[PDB]
Amino acid sequence: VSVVGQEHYDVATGVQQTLQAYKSLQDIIAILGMDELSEQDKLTVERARKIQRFLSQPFAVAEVFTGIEGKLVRLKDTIASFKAVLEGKYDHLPENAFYMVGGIEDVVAKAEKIAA
Amino acid sequence: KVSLVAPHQAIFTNKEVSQVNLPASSGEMGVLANHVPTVEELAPGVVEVIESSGTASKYFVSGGFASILPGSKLSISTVEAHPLDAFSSENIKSLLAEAQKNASSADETVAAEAAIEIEVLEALQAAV
Amino acid sequence: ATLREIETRLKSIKNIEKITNTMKVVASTRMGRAQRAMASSRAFREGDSDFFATAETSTPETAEKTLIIAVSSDKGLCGSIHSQIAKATRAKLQETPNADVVTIGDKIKAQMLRTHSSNVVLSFNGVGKEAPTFWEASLIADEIRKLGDYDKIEVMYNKFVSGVAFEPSVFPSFSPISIEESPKLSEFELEEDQAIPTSLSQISLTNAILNAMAEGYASEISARRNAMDNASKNAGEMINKYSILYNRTRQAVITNELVDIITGASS
Amino acid sequence: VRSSAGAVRDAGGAFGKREQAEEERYFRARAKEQLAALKKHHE
Amino acid sequence: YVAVGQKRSTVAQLVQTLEQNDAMKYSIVVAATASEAAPLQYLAPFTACAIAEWFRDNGKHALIVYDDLSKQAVAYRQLSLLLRRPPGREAYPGDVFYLHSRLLERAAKMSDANGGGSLTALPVIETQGGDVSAYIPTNVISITDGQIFLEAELFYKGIRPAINVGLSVSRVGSAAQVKAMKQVAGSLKLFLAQYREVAAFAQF
Amino acid sequence: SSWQKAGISFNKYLAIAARTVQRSLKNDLKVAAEKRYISDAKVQKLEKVSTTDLASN
C-alpha cells in the first residue's frame, strides 16, 4: 500500500482472496455439486469464474493463434475494471463476456453483442 | 388421500387422491372419501386407484397390509407394486408351468412353495 | 537418514496418497447410489409403521431379560464407526446386563467380546460388503433364536443425521404380546381369527432391520469418505516434509563426496 | 519420487511389515480349507 | 552407430544382426570398446560426428547414435584426473557440461543455402536407478530438444517397448511429422492423457 | 395358505410373494432387481464366546 497506493492495494487483496477461496473449494464442488451451498458461497463462486478469464487478455503478437485483436490495458483501466466486478456492477453479465478481453469498456461491448 | 409407499419407491406419497380399490384378504374392498378404520391384510391382486375421473392407474400389488387411519388416510404398504402393462404374457406362462409340475413332487418346503406361486400367477394372468 | 532410506520412505508415502485419493473419489460415487436406498427406506418406515403411532404401542415390564441387536459392518477404515456403535450399546447394558446381544458384523463382535463376551448370543458375518436388501433382513429375523419371547427388542445402529457426520440411534421393536395390548389397537377392523397379532410383529422385525441396515450403510460410507480425505491430506503434509529433508540430504551428499576427493588429491 | 512399483514392501517400515503379515494370515486360513477338502475327496 | 563403453561381444552381435536384414551397407560403425585407453573412448564422440557431418554438408541426411552418453563422460574424467587437474562434482572436470553440449550442437538441420542436409543425434543416457535428475543425466536432458524415458516397471507388464507418455516429450511438436499421421495423433494425445490420471479406478 | 403350521412367519411369506412376482414379469425389465432377492449373509448362534455351526440356507 506504500508503493502502489491504497486504491491499488485494496483491489489486489480482494481479487487474491476470491481466487484462493475458489481454488480450495474445488474439491468439495466435485463431490457435493454446485447447488448444495449457501447464498454467500453461490455468489462468490459465480464471480470467481469471470474474474479468472478477465485477466487473460490477448496480446498483439499472439493474434495469429487466437484470432482476437491485441488489447493493451493501462494501470488505471485495469484497477477500475476489477473494482466494479467485485462490488456487484457486473453480476448480471455472462462468464464468457470477460474471456479474451481487456478493460472495462471491452466487457460491455462484448456482452451486448453476444446475445443480440 | 392415499399413502401407497413401497419399500423401494413412493407412489401416492402426498395426499392427492379420491378413490382406491385394493384386493384385501376377505374381498375386493375399496376406499372412498372418509373411510372407516380397517387394518386388513392385502392379498396378491390388483390395486387400482381412481384419480377423480377415469384416470385410474392399475397397480398389480404383490400383497401387503392395507391400513386405514381414522383421519381419512389410507396407507397401502406393499412389497412390490407394478403396473399391468409392465408384465409379459409369454414370460408369465413359463412361471406358471414350472410351479405346477414342481408341486407335490418332493418334500420339505418345495411342494408348499409351489402351491402359493401357482395361485398368484393365475390371478394376474386373468386380468389382462 | 541416508539417501537410500529417504527415497524408500518418499516413494512409499506417495503410493499411499494415490490410493487414499482414489478411495475418496470412489466413496463419493457410492454415496450417491446409497442415498436413494436410504431415502426410500425412510418413506417405508413412516407408512408401514404408521399403525403403531396411532395405537400407542409401548412395552412395560421385563420378561426374561431382553434382546439386543447391534447392526454394523465387517470391514474397517471408516473412522469411529465401530467405536461409536460399541459405546452406545455398552451404556444401555449397565441397567440390564442379563440381556442377550446379536452382533451383525465382525467389527461390532470384536469390541463387544472384550467387555461382555457372555452376552453375545448370535453372530452374523458378511453383511457389510454389498448394500442391504429385503432378502438379508428377512433371513436374519426368522433365525434369531426365538425373538418373540422377549419384552423389549432394541436395534442398535448408526443414523446419518447429516451428509458428513452421524450419530448412534436406537429403535425399539414390539413383540406379538405387546402389539395386541395397545390403547387404540381395537380401533381398526382386524380379523381376530387369522394371524393379526403375530403377523404385525413378524413384518415389523424385517422392516426395522432393513431400515437400520440402510441407514447404517450410508453413515459408514459417509464416515469412510471423511477418513479417506483426512488420510490423503495427512499424506501430503508428510510428503512435503520428507521432500525438504531429501533435498537437504542430496546437497549434503554431493558436498561430502566432493570434499573426500579434494582432500586426497591435495595430499 | 518416481518408480513406485512395490515401494511399500521395499521400505521395511510399519506399512511393509503389515503387508506381509496380512498376506500370510490370509494364505494360512485358505490352506486349512484346501487341505481338509482334499482329504475327504481322495477316493 | 557409435558403440562406446561396450564390450567386444556386444559390438559383434549388433553388426551381425544389421547385415542379415540389409542394413549395414549404409551405416557407419564406430568401434570403441572399454579394453582400449581412455583417450580412444573419450574421442569416440568427436570422431563419429566428423564422419557423419560430410553427408549433411553435401545434400544428404545422417543419424548418429552415441551409445552411450554415460560411458563417454567416464572416459573424459579419467584422462583429466591423471593429468594433474582439479576436479568438480561427481569426480568430473570443470568442462563437464561443455564436453557434451559441443558434440550435440553440431547435429542440426541446415538451410537451403548450405545444401539442405541434416544430422540426428541419438544419445543414450544410462541412468542409475530411474533417477532422471542426476549429474550426467540432467546435463544431457537440458541440452537436447527432447528425451525418451524408459522405465523398468513398464517393461515387465507387457508394454514393448517401455515408453512413458507422461515423461517423454518432443520440443519440435507436430511440425516435423507427416500430415496423414498428425490427424490421428491429435485426438489420441488427449485420450491417453485423461486415461493415465484416471487409471487408479481400474481396480474397482 | 397354511403358513401357520410351518416355521414361516409374516416376514418369510412377504419375501416369497415379492420374489415370485418379480421373476414372472418381464425379463428385460429386471434391471437393478436381482440383487434384492439374493444375499450371501450367514447366521451363527453363539453360546457363553464360542459358537456353533454357521448356517446360511
User: For residue B13, is it left (φ>0), alpha (ψ between -120 and 50) or beta?
Assistant: left
Chains E and F touch (3+ CB pairs under 8 A): no
Cis, bond preceding E161 (omega within 30 deg of 0):
yes
Three-state secondary-structure class, residue A109: helix
E171 is catalytic: yes
Per-residue HEC secondary structure of chain B comes to CECCECCCCECCCCCCCCEEEEEECCCEEEECCCCCCCCEEECCCEEEEECCCCCCEEEEECCEEEEEECCCEEEEEECCEEEHHHCCHHHHHHHHHHHHHHCCCCCCCHHHHHHHHHHHHHHHHCCC
CA-based torsion, B27, B31, B32, B33: positive or negative:
positive
- Give the C-side interface with B, CB within 8 Å: 40-41, 43-44, 46-48, 50-51, 54, 134, 187-191, 194, 196, 199, 203, 207, 210
The residue in chain B having the minimum alpha-carbon distance to the alpha carbon of residue C44 is B7
The residue in chain B having the minimum alpha-carbon distance to the alpha carbon of residue F8 is B109
**In this structure, what is the dihedral angle of CA atoms C141, C144, C147, C150, given to the nearest 10 degrees?**
-130
Q: For residue C207, which of B74, F20, B79 has the smallest C-alpha distance?
A: B79
Mark E39-55 as b/e (b = at least 16 C-beta within 10 Å).
Answer: ebbbbbbeebbeebbeb
Q: For residue B44, which of B70, B16, B101, B82 has the smallest C-alpha distance?
A: B82
CA C220 to chain centre: 5
How far is residue C18's CA from residue D13's CA, in Å, rounded to a whole number?
A: 19
Residue C199: CB atoms within 10 A of its CB come to 23
Please answer whether residues C204 and C49 qualify as being in contact, where contact means their C-beta atoms are separated by less than 8 angstroms.
yes
The grid cell for C112 is 463387544
Radius of gyration of chain C (CA): 27
Tell me, yes or no, if E166 comes closer than 8 A to chain D by beta carbon.
Answer: no
Q: How many residues does chain D have?
A: 43
Residue C79 identity (one-letter amino acid) = G
Collect all residues of chain B within an 8 Å Cβ-Cβ radius of residue F8.
109
Strands (E) in E14-102, as ranges, are 30-32, 61-64, 66-67
How far is residue A59's CA from residue A68's CA, in Å, rounded to a whole number?
A: 9
Radius of gyration of chain B (CA): 16
CA-based torsion, C193, B117, C176, C197: positive or negative:
negative
Please answer whether residues B48 and B38 qualify as being in contact, where contact means their C-beta atoms are separated by less than 8 angstroms.
no
Question: How far is C228 from chain F, CA to nearest CA, in Å?
Answer: 27
Please answer whether residues C115 and C90 qualify as being in contact, where contact means their C-beta atoms are separated by less than 8 angstroms.
yes
* CA C234 to each of CA B115, C15, C231, D3, D9: distance values in angstroms, whole numbers, following the listed order: 61, 13, 5, 22, 21
| Superfamily grouping for domain D1-43 | Single helix bin (1.20.5.500)
Q: What is the resolution of this structure in A?
A: 7.0
CA A41 to chain centre: 17
State the alpha helices, DSSP H only, in chain C.
3-47, 50-55, 81-92, 106-112, 134-142, 176-179, 197-265
- Give which of E80, E82, E83, E90 to mutate to test C binding, by max C Cβ within 10 Å: E90
Radius of gyration of chain E (CA): 20
Residue C110: CB atoms within 10 A of its CB come to 14
Collect all residues of chain A within an 8 Å Cβ-Cβ radius of residue C28.
30-31
Please answer whether residues C111 and C82 qualify as being in contact, where contact means their C-beta atoms are separated by less than 8 angstroms.
yes
Cis, bond preceding C74 (omega within 30 deg of 0):
no
- Give which of C33, C38, C40, C44 to mutate to test B binding, by max B Cβ within 10 Å: C44
State the angle between helix axes of A75-87 and A39-54 in degrees (0 to 180), rounded to the nearest 10: 160
Please answer whether residues E44 and E30 qualify as being in contact, where contact means their C-beta atoms are separated by less than 8 angstroms.
yes
Determine how β-strand E146-147 pairs with β-strand E169-170: antiparallel
The grid cell for E194 is 485423461
Give the closest of F16, F24, F27 to B116, CB-based.
F16
CA E156 to chain centre: 23
Give me the catalytic one of E8, E85, E171, E196. Answer: E171
Collect all residues of chain E within an 8 Å Cβ-Cβ radius of residue C18.
200
The grid cell for C25 is 473419489
Tell me, yes or no, if C28 comes closer than 8 A to chain A by beta carbon.
Answer: yes
How far is residue C89's CA from residue C104's CA, in Å, rounded to a whole number?
A: 13
Question: How far is C258 from chain E, CA to nearest CA, in Å?
Answer: 6
Three-state secondary-structure class, residue E197: helix
Collect all residues of chain C within an 8 Å Cβ-Cβ radius of residue A31.
25, 28, 225
How far is residue B21's CA from residue B42's CA, in Å, rounded to a whole number?
A: 11
First to last CA, chain B: 27
> What single DSSP character describes residue E199?
G
Mark E159-186 as b/e (b = at least 16 C-beta within 10 Å).
Answer: eeeeeeeeeeeeeeeeeeeeeeeeeeee
Contact D3 E151 (CB under 8 A): yes
> Cβ-count burial of E5 within 10 angstroms (0-12 exposed, 13-18 middle, 19+ buried)?
buried
How far is residue C238's CA from residue C13's CA, in Å, rounded to a whole number?
A: 8
Question: How far is C246 from chain E, CA to nearest CA, in Å?
Answer: 13
The residue in chain C having the minimum alpha-carbon distance to the alpha carbon of residue E134 is C250
The DSSP string of D8-19 is HHHH-SHHHHHH
Indicate which technique resolved this structure.
Answer: cryo-EM
Three-state secondary-structure class, residue C176: helix
Collect all residues of chain F within an 8 Å Cβ-Cβ radius of residue B117.
16, 20
Chains D and B touch (3+ CB pairs under 8 A): no
Residue E157 C-beta-side C-alpha neighbours within 13 Å: 10
> Cβ-count burial of B125 within 10 angstroms (0-12 exposed, 13-18 middle, 19+ buried)?
middle
Determine how β-strand B19-23 pairs with β-strand B28-31: antiparallel
Chains D and C touch (3+ CB pairs under 8 A): yes
* CA B39 to each of CA B66, C173, C180, C212: distance values in angstroms, whole numbers, following the listed order: 6, 19, 13, 25
Number of cross-chain residue pairs from C and D with Cβ atoms under 8 Å apart = 31
Please answer whether residues C216 and C71 qualify as being in contact, where contact means their C-beta atoms are separated by less than 8 angstroms.
yes
Phi first, then psi, for residue F12 (nearest 5°) are -80, -25
The DSSP string of A50-93 is HHHHHS-PPPSTTHHHH-SPP----HHHHHHHHHHHHHTTTSSS
Phi first, then psi, for residue C52 (nearest 5°) are -75, -30
Which residues does E36 contact at the CB level (< 8 Å), separation at least 6? Answer: none
Collect all residues of chain E within an 8 Å Cβ-Cβ radius of residue C262.
86-87
The residue in chain C having the minimum alpha-carbon distance to the alpha carbon of residue F9 is C202
